């Protein structure tokens, strides 16, 4: 093991928690900010804890990065996750981005796991289909993205935590769920995967993704309700 946090505690050494007004990407609906991400207990797992909540019509949540602190090249990076049932507009994800200094998309994304998307509710699965992708690219207008979608063989919002793992070599990124491969993308000639990513968790509510962007069809978050995504643990080999 290179590296494991086990979230006894939020360490500042490594992780940040960020701001951002609503609709600051992707038109989501939550403001991120600090008071949304904590770190405490899921009975006997102490655990990273994002929470979205909704007050009217302001909606609040977490996300959190390791930028500047903890980045790494070609490992293999896993983490524990119990996610919210997220039908109705709830979109989480485990994903990584390069970590210099250059403007999205030129700093690569590699989104591990990400759930709650528009096609998983109409194909009536929302519980058990998963997006992974990359993007890259010089610049917005030049922006590029490899994906790939699937459904896995059990609900991954079924109140227990779940393994998602990328493998990376100079080749392959290989994404896993529960030890099963999910899906591999061939980076050997892609000149944006092979520097150090840094790792992000977020909760995001609402947004393009989700096909919900306007609060009025958001039944995954009621006005008065709070939701929590879990994280047992991550660590990198």
């Known amino acids: 093991i290179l590296f494991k946090d086990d979230f006894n505690f939020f360490d500042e050494k490594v992780w940040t928690k960020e701001t951002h007004e609503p609709g ?3 038109q989501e609906l939550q403001a991120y900010d600090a008071a949304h991400v904590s770190v405490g207990k899921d009975g006997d797992k102490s655990v990273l804890i994002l929470t979205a ?6 909606i609040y949540s977490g996300r959190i990065n390791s930028k500047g602190k903890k980045s790494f090249k070609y490992r293999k990076i896993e983490a524990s996750i119990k996610l919210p049932k997220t039908n109705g507009g709830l979109w989480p994800a485990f994903w990584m981005m390069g970590d210099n200094d250059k403007q999205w998309p030129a700093c690569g994304e590699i989104d591990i796991m990400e759930m709650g998307e528009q096609s998983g509710m109409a194909a009536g699965d929302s519980e058990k289909q998963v997006n ?3 993007h890259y690219g ?4 030049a922006h590029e993205q490899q994906y790939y979608k699937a459904n896995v063989a059990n609900s991954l919002q079924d109140g227990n935590y779940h393994t998602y793992s990328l493998d990376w070599d100079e080749n392959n990124l290989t994404i896993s769920i529960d030890n099963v491969k999910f899906h591999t993308f061939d980076i050997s000639s892609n000149t944006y995967f ?4 840094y790792i992000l968790f977020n909760l995001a509510v609402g947004g393009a993704f ?5 609060i009025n069809k958001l039944t995954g978050l009621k006005d008065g309700q709070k939701v929590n995504m879990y994280i047992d643990w991550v660590k990198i080999l």
């Open 24 to 26: 600051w990407t992707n």
């Open 53 to 58: 909540e909704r007050k009217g019509n302001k």
């Open 132 to 134: 992974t992708a990359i």
């Open 138 to 141: 010089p610049s917005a207008a």
């Open 194 to 197: 092979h520097d150090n990513f």
């Open 210 to 214: 989700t096909g919900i962007t306007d």
